[PDB]
PDB file of C-alpha atoms and ligand atoms in Angstrom:
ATOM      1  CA  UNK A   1     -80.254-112.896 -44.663  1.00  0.00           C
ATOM      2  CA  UNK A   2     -79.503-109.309 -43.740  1.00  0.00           C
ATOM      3  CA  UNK A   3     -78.278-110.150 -40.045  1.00  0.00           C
ATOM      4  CA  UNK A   4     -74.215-111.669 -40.451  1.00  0.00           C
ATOM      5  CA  UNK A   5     -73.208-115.080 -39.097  1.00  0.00           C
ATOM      6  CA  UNK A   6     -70.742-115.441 -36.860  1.00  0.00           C
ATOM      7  CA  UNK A   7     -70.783-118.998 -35.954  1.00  0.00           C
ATOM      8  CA  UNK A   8     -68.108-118.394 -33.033  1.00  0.00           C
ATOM      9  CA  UNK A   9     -70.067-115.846 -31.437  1.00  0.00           C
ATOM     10  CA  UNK A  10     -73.343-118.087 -31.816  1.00  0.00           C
ATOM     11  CA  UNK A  11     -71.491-120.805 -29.983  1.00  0.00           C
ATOM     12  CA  UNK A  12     -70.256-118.555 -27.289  1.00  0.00           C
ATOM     13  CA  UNK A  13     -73.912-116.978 -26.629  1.00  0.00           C
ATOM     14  CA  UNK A  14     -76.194-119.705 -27.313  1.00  0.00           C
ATOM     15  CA  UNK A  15     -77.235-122.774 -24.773  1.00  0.00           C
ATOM     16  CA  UNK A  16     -77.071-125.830 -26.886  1.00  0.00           C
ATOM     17  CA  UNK A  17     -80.523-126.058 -27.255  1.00  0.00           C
ATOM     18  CA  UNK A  18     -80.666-122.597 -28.668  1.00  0.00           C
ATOM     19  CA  UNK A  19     -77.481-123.309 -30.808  1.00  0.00           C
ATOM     20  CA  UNK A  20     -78.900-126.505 -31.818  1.00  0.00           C
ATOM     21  CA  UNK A  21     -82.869-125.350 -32.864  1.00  0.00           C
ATOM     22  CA  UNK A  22     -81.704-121.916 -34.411  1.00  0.00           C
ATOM     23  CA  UNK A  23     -78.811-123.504 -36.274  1.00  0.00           C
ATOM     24  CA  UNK A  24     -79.147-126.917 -36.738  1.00  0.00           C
ATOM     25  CA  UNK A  25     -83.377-127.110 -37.030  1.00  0.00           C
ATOM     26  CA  UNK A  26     -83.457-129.029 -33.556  1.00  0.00           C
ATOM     27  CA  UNK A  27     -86.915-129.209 -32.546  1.00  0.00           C
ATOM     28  CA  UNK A  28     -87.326-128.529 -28.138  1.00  0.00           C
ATOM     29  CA  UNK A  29     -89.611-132.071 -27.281  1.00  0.00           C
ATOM     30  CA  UNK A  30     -92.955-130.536 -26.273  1.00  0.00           C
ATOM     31  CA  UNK A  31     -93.935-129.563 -22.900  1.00  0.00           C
ATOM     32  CA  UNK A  32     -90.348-129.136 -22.277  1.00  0.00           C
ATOM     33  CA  UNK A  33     -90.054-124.878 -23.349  1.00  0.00           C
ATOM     34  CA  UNK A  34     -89.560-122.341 -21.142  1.00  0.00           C
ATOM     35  CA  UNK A  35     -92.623-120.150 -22.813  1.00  0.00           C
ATOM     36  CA  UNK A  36     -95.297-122.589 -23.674  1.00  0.00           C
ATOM     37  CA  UNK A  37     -97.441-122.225 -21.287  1.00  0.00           C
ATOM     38  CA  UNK A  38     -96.603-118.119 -20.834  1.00  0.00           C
ATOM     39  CA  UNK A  39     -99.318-115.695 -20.635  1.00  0.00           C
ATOM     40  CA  UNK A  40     -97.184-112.301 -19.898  1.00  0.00           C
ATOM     41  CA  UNK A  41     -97.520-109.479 -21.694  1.00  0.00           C
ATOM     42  CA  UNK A  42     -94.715-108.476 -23.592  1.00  0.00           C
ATOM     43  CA  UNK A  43     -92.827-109.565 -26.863  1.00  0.00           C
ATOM     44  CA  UNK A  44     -91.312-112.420 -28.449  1.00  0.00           C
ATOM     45  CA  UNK A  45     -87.595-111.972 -30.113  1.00  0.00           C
ATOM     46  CA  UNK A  46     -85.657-113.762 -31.896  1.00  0.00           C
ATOM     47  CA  UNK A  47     -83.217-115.474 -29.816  1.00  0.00           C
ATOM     48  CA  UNK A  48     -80.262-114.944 -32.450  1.00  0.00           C
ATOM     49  CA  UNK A  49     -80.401-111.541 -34.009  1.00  0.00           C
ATOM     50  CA  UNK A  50     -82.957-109.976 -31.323  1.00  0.00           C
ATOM     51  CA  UNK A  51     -85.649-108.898 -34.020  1.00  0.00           C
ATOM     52  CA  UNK A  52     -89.401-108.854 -32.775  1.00  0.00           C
ATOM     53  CA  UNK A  53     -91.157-111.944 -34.224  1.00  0.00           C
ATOM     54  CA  UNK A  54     -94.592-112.342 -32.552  1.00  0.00           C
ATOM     55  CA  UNK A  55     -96.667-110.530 -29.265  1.00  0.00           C
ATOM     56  CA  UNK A  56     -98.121-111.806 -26.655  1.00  0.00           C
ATOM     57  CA  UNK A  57    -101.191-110.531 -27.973  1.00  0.00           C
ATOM     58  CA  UNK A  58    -101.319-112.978 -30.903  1.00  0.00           C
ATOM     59  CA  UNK A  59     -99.677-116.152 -28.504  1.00  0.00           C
ATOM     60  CA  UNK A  60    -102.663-118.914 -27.848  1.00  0.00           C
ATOM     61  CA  UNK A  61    -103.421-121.942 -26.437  1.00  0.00           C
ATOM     62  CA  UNK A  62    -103.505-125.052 -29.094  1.00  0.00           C
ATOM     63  CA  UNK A  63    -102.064-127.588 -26.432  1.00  0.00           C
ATOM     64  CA  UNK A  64     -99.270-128.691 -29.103  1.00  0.00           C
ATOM     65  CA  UNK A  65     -96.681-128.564 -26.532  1.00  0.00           C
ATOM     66  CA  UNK A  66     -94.610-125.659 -28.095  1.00  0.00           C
ATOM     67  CA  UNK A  67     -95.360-122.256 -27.643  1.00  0.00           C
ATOM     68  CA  UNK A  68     -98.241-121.217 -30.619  1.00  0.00           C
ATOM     69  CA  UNK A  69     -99.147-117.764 -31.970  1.00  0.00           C
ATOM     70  CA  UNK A  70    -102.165-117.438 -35.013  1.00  0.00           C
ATOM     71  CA  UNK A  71    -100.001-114.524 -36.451  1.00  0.00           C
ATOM     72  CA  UNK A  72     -96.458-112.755 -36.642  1.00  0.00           C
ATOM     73  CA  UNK A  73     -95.972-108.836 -35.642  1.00  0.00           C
ATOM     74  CA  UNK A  74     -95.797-108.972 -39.109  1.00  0.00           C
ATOM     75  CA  UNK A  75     -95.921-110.329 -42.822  1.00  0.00           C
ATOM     76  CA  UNK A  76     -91.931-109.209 -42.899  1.00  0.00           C
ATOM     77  CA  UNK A  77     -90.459-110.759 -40.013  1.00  0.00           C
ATOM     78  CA  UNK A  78     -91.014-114.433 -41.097  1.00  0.00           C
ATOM     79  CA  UNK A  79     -89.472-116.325 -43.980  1.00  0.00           C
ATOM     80  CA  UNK A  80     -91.398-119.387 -45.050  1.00  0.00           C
ATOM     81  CA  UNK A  81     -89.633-122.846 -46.460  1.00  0.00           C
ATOM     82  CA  UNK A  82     -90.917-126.388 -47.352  1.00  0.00           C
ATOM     83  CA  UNK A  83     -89.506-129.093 -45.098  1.00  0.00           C
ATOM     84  CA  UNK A  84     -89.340-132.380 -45.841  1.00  0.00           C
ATOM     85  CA  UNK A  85     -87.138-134.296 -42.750  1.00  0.00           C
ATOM     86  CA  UNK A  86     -88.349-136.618 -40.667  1.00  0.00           C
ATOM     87  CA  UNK A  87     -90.521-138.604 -42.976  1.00  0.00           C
ATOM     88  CA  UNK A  88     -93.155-135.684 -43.263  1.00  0.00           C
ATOM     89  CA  UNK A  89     -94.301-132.525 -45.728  1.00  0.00           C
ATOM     90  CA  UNK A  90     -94.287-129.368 -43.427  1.00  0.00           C
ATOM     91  CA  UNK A  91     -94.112-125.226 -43.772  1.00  0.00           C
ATOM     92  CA  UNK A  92     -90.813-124.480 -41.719  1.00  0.00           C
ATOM     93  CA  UNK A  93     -90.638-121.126 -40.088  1.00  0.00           C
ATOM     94  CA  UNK A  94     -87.209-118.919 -39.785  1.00  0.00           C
ATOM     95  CA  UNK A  95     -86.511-115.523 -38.765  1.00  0.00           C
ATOM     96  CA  UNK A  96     -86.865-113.205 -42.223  1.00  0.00           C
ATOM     97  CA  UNK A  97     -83.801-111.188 -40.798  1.00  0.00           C
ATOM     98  CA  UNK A  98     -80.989-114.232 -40.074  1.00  0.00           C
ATOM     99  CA  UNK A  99     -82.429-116.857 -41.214  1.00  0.00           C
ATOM    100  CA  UNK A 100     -82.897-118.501 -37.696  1.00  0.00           C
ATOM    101  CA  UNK A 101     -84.985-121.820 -37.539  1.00  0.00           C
ATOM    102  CA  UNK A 102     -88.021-121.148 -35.510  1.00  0.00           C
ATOM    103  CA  UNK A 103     -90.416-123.917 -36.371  1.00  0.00           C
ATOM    104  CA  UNK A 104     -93.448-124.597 -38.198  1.00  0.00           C
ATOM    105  CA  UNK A 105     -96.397-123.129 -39.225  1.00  0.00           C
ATOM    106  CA  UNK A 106     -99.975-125.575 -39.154  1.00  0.00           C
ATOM    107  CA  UNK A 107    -103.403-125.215 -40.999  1.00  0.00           C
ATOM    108  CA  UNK A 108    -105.057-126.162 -37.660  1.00  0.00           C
ATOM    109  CA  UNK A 109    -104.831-122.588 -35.989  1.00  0.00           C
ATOM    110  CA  UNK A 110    -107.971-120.725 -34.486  1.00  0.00           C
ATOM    111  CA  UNK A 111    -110.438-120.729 -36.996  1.00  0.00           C
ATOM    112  CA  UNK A 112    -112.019-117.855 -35.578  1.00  0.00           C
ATOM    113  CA  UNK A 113    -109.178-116.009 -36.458  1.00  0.00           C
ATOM    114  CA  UNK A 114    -106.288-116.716 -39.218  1.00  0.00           C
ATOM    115  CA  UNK A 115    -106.339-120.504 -38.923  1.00  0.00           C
ATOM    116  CA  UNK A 116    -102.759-120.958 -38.507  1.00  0.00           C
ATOM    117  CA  UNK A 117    -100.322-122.513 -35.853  1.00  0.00           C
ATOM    118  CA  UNK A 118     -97.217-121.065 -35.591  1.00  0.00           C
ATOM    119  CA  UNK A 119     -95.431-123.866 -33.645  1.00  0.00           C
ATOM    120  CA  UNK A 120     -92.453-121.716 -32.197  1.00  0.00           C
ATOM    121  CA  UNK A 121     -89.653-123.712 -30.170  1.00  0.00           C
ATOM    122  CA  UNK A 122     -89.092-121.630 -26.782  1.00  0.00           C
ATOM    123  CA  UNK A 123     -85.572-122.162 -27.085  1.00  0.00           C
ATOM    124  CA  UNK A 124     -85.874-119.585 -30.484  1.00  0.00           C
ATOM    125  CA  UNK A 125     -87.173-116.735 -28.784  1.00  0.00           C
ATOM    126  CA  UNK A 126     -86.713-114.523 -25.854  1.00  0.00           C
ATOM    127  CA  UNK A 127     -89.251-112.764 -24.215  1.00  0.00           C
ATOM    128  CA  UNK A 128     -88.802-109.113 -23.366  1.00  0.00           C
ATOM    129  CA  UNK A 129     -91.592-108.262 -20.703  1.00  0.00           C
ATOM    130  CA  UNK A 130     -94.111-104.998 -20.764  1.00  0.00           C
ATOM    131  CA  UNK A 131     -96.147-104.997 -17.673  1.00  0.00           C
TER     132      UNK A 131
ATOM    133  CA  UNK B   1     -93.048-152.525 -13.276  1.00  0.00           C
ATOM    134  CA  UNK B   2     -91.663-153.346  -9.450  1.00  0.00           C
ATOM    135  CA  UNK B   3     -90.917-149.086  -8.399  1.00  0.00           C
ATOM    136  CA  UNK B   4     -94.297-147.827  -7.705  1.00  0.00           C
ATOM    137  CA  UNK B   5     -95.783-145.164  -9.755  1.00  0.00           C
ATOM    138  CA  UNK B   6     -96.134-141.556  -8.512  1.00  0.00           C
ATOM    139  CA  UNK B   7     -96.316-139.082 -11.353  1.00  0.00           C
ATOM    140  CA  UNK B   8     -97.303-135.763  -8.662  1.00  0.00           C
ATOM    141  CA  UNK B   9     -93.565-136.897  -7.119  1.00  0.00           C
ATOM    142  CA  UNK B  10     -92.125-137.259 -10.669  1.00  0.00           C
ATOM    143  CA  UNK B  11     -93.477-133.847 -12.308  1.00  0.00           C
ATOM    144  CA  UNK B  12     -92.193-132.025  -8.563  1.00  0.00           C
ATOM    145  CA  UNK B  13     -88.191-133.610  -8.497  1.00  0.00           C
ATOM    146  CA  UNK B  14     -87.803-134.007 -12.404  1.00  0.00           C
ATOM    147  CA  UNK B  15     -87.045-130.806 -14.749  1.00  0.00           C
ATOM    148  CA  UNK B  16     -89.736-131.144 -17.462  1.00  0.00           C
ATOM    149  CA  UNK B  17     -87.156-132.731 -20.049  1.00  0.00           C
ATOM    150  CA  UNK B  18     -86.379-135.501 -17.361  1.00  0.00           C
ATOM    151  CA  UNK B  19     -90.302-135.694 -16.806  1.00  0.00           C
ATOM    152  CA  UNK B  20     -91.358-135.775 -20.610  1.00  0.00           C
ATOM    153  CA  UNK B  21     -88.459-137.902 -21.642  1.00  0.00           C
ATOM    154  CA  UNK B  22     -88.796-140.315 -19.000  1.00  0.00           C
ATOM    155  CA  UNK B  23     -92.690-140.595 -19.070  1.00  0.00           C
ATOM    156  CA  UNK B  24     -93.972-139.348 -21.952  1.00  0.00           C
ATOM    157  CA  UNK B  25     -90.875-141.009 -24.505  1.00  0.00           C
ATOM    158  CA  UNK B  26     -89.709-137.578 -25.648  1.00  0.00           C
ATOM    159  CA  UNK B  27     -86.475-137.476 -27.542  1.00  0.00           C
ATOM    160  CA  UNK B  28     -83.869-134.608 -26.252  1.00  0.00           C
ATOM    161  CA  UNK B  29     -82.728-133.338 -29.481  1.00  0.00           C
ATOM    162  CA  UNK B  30     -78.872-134.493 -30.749  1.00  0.00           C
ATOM    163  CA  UNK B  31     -75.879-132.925 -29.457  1.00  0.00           C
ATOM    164  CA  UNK B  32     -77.948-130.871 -26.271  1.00  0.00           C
ATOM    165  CA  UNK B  33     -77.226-133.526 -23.667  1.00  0.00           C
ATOM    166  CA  UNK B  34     -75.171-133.485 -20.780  1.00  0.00           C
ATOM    167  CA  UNK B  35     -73.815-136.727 -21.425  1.00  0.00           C
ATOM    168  CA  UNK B  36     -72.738-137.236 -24.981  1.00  0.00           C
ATOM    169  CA  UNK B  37     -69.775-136.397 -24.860  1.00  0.00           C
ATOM    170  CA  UNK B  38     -68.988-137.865 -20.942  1.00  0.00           C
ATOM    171  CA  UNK B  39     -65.816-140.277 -20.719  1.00  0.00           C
ATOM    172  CA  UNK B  40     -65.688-140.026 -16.779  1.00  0.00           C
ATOM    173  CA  UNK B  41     -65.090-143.078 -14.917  1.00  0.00           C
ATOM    174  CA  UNK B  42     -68.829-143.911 -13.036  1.00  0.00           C
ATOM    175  CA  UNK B  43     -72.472-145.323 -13.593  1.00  0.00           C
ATOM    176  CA  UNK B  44     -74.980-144.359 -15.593  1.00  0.00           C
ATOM    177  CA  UNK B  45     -78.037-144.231 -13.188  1.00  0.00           C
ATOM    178  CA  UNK B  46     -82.570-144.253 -14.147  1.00  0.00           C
ATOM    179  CA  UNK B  47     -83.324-140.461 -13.064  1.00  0.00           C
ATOM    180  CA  UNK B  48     -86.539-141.447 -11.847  1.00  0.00           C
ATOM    181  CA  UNK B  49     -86.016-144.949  -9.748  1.00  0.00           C
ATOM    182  CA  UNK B  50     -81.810-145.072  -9.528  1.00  0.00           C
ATOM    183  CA  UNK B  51     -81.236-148.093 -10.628  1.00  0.00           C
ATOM    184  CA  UNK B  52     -77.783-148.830 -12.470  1.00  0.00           C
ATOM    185  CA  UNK B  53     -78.505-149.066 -15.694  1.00  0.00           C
ATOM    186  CA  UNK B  54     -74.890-148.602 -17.595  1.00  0.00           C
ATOM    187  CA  UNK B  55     -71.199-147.960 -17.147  1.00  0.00           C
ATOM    188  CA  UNK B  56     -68.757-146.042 -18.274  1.00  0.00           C
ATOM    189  CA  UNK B  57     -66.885-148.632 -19.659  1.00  0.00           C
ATOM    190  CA  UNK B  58     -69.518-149.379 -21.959  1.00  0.00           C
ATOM    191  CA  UNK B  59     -70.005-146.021 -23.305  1.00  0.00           C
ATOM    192  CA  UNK B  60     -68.259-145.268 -26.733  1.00  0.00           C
ATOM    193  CA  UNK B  61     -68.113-142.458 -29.084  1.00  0.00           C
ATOM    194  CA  UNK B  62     -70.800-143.000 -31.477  1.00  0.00           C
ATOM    195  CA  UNK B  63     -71.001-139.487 -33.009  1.00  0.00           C
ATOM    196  CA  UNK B  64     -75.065-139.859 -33.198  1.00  0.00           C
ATOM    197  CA  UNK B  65     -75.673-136.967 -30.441  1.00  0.00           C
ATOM    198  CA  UNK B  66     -76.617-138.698 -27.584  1.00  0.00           C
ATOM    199  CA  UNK B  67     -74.974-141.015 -25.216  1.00  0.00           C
ATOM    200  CA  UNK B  68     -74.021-144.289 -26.988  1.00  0.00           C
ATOM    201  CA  UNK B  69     -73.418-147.589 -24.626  1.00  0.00           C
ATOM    202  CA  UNK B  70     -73.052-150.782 -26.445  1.00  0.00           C
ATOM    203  CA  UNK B  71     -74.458-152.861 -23.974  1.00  0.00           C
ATOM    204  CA  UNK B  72     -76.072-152.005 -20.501  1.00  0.00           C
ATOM    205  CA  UNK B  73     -74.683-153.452 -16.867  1.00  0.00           C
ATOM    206  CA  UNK B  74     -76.410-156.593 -17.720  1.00  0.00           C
ATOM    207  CA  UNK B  75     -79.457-157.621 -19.513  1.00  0.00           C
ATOM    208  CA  UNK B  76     -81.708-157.590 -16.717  1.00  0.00           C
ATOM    209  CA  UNK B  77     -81.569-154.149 -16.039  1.00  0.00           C
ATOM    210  CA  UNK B  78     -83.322-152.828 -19.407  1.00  0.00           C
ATOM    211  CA  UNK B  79     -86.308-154.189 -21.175  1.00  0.00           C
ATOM    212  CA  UNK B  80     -86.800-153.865 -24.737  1.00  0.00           C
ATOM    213  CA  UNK B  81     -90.119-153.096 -26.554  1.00  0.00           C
ATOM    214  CA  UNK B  82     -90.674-152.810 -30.500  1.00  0.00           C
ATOM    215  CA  UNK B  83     -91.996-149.202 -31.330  1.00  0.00           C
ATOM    216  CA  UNK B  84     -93.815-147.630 -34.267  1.00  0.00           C
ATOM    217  CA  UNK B  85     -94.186-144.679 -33.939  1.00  0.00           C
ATOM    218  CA  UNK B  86     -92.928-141.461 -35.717  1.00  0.00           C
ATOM    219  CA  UNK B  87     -93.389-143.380 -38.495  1.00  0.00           C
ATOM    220  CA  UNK B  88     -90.682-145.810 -37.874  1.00  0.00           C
ATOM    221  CA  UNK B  89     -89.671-149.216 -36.890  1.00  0.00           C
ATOM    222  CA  UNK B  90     -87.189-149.197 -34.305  1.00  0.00           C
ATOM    223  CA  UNK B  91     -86.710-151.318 -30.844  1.00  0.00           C
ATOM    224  CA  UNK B  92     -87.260-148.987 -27.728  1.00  0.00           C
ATOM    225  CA  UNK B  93     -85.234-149.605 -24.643  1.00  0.00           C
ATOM    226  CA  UNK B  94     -87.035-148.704 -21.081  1.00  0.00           C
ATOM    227  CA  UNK B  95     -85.321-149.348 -17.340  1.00  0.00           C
ATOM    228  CA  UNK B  96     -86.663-152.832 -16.045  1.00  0.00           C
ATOM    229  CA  UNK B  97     -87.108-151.106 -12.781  1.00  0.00           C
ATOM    230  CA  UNK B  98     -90.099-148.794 -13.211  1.00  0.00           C
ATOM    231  CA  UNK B  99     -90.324-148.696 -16.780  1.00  0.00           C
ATOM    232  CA  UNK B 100     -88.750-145.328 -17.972  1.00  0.00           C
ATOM    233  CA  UNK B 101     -88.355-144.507 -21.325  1.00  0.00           C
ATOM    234  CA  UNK B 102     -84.362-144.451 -22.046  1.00  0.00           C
ATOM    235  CA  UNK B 103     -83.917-144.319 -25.599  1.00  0.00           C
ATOM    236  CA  UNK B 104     -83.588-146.658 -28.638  1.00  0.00           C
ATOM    237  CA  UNK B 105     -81.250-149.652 -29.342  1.00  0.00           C
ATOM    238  CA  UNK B 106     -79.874-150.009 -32.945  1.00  0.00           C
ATOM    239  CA  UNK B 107     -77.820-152.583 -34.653  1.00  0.00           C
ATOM    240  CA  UNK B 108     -74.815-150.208 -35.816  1.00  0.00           C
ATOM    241  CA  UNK B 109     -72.694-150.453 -33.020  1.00  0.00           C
ATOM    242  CA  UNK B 110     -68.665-151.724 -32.690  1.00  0.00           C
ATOM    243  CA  UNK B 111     -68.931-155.337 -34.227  1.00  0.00           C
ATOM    244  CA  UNK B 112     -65.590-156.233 -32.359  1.00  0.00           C
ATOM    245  CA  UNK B 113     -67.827-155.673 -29.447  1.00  0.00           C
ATOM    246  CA  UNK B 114     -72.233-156.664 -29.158  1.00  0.00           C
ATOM    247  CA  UNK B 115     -72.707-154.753 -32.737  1.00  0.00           C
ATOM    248  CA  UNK B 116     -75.509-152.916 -30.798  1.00  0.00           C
ATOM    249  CA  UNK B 117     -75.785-149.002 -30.222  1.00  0.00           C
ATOM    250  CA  UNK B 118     -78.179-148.205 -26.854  1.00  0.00           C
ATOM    251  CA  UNK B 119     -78.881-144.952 -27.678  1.00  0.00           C
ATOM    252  CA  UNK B 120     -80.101-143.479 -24.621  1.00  0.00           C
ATOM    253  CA  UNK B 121     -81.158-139.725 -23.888  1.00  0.00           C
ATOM    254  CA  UNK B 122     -78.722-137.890 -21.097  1.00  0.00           C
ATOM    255  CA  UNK B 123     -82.458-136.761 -19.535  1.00  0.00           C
ATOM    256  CA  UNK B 124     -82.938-140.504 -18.727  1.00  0.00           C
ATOM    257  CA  UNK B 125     -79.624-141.117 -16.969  1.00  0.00           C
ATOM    258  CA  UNK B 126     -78.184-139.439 -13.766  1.00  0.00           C
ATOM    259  CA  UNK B 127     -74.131-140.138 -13.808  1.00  0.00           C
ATOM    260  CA  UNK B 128     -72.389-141.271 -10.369  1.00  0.00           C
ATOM    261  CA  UNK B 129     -68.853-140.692 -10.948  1.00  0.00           C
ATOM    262  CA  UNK B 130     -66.378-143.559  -9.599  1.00  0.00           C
ATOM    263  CA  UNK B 131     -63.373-141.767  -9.748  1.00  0.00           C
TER     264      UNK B 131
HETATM  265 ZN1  LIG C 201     -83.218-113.705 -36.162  1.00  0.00          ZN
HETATM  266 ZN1  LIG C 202     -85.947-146.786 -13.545  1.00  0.00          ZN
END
């Protein structure tokens, strides 16, 4: 990952829950993030290394409990990785540019549209406004 | 459960991890509690109904990442309920009081002592200090 670690500065800057999800693949319980129910306009970054990850344009609502988007700014910004914790065979989600865990991605998006979930923990991201 | 039920009240005075752990048996995620890591003299209080659930001088340093007790003020204070779910057997521990989920009781705790770990989540507990 292009972005360097500094695990002292992480510390410094980062709640625990954002230490704790981006770091140690925490997952935020649902209904308990600060943007799953948002409906601004404006962009999602990467709560770590800053990078754009997904617009508000793309965010939906799936009623997971964790903020869900059918699609990434882009095809670059995401790095995909098999997980197998917690008794179960998922597609975990990190930031392509420091390697930040973000969440998962889900088969059981809009159908309409791509047809995937990205399951983002709020505590990952920060959202930079554009009204 | 004797405290009477008013979820409008609950989702107004608890923050949405209080709310979803208490009522909805969400998990905070290891080493993000307020808690953990408390050795203060006090008592470990329900958030929602205030009853008196543990003390300090029951608490230990488990290392799991969330407040470990090994047994609660006395045994009429918590009830205990199997639970299956998240694909796992494990024994549930809720406040006698109103019936609040706390957390999860395990049998790895200090065998000079009960041999049990009550594993609660900090969201669950509000501390009085006894200083
Ligand atoms: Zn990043
Ligand atoms: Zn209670």
């Amino acid at each position: 990952y292009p972005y360097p670690k500094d695990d002292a500065e992480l510390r410094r800057r980062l709640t625990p829950m954002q230490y704790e999800v981006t770091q140690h693949a925490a997952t935020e319980p649902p209904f308990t993030g600060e943007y799953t129910d948002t409906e601004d306009a404006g962009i999602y970054h990467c709560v770590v290394c800053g990078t754009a990850l997904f617009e508000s344009g793309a965010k939906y609502h799936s009623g997971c409990g964790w903020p869900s988007y059918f699609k990434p700014i882009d095809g670059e910004v995401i790095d995909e990785k098999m997980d197998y914790t917690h008794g179960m065979t998922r597609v975990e989600v990190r930031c392509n540019q420091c390697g930040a865990h973000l969440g998962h991605v889900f088969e059981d998006g809009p159908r309409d549209k791509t047809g995937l979930r990205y399951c983002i923990n709020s505590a990952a991201l920060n959202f930079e406004a554009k009204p």
